[PDB]
Amino acid sequence: DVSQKIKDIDDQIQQLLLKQRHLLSKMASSMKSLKNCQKELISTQILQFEAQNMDVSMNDVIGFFNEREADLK
Amino acid sequence: DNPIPKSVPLHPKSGKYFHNLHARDLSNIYQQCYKQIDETINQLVDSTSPSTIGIEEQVADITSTYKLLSTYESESNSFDEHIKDLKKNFKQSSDACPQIDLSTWDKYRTGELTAPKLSELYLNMPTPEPATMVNNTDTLKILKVLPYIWNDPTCVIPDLQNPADEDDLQIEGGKIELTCPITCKPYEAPLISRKCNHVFDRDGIQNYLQGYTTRDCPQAACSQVVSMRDFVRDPIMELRCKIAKMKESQEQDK
Amino acid sequence: KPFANTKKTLENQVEELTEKCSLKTDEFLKAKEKINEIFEKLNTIRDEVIKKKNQNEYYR
Numbered sequence A: 001d002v003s004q005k006i007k008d009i010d011d012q013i014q015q016l017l018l019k020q021r022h023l024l025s026k027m028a029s030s031m032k033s034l035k036n037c038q039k040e041l042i043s044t045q046i047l048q049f050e051a052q053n054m055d056v057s058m059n060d061v062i063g064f065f066n067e068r069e070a071d072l073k
Numbered sequence B: 001d002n003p004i005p006k007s008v009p010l011h012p013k014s015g016k017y018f019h020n021l022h023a024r025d026l027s028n029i030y031q032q033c034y035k036q037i038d039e040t041i042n043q044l045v046d047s048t049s050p051s052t053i054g055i056e057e058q059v060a061d062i063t064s065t066y067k068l069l070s071t072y073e074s075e076s077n078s079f080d081e082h083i084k085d086l087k088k089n090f091k092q093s094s095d096a097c098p099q100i101d102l103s104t105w106d107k108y109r110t111g112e113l114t115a116p117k118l119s120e121l122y123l124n125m126p127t128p129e130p131a132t133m134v135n136n137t138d139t140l141k142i143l144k145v146l147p148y149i150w151n152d153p154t155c156v157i158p159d160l161q162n163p164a165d166e167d168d169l170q171i172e173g174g175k176i177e178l179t180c181p182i183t184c185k186p187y188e189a190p191l192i193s194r195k196c197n198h199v200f201d202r203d204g205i206q207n208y209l210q211g212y213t214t215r216d217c218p219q220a221a222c223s224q225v226v227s228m229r230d231f232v233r234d235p236i237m238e239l240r241c242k243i244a245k246m247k248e249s250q251e252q253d254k
Numbered sequence C: 001k002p003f004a005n006t007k008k009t010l011e012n013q014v015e016e017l018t019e020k021c022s023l024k025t026d027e028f029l030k031a032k033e034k035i036n037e038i039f040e041k042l043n044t045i046r047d048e049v050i051k052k053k054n055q056n057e058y059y060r
């Protein structure tokens, strides 16, 4: 009857081989979601860089503006 | 009206922020995805229950995600290329613009002077697909062939330099030998040549080229001058022998 | 001066974008972690196969 254990364990192997194929599908899906986060991160960062670059520029000009006044008098 | 300009050039203090802009590297993750893929065909081949079905389904599923992942990767590689170019173009365009000052600031606001706007240049990138080459990845050939060699480890596979090409293979007649032409014994460490598609067992050419710099290819002394470096490991041939050995093994105990 | 108000609105937007980048970073690192959990589940399953195998190798 020991001829049966070789079949159940041989089937379990098959169920596990299937599960691998399913998880491999999830993995690819997961990758796609990762690429989206990566894309969204770089986008938000470029906006931040712009706004922040405009900010330090504003600081400069304001600094110069206040000079034409504090010296004008 | 228009209190703030449409754009201003790259400020010296923003140099480091601009420099650090890049899309997050995924090379390491893609690598593991492919490795995970590989390890799956191995266990598949090595643990699939007795044939008479081939494995055409399993292979179809795996190749489906493999190509998906590969489609994703190409987009990622393309993404970096575009980011880098767009940035290089921005920096050069930004560097020709006058710095911001009491006079300059009004000009950038009014439009007299115009600086490049990275956010817009970013949104308006090429965006084509695939834009790359149908790389002949070693792991793609195994998938293409696998179903055919499973049901017949000797079936003569004809020329394939562009796998993934949904089309059936021109399976010739007869059958190839799972035995090294320089040992006349079944393989155990198949090696394929790069400049010619001849496969010899490792100890075959290992001793054939042993003591020599560049001897002509053993097979009918095939013109191709060869060396050990020209011999890669043959996954396809190893698959064949692997399968044959499993068939012989399954013929005795089933 | 004539800037005070706009500049204020500008400083805040930069503050908001900064928190946004921080969020997208954690969101991105989170996704990275999700896929690593899948590499992990794939790896363990393979170990099971290797073991169920060795069992039959022994014939039981």
Ligand SMILES: [Zn+2]
Pocket: B193, B196, B197, B198, B217, B218, B219, B222, B223, B224
């Ligand atoms: Zn040759």
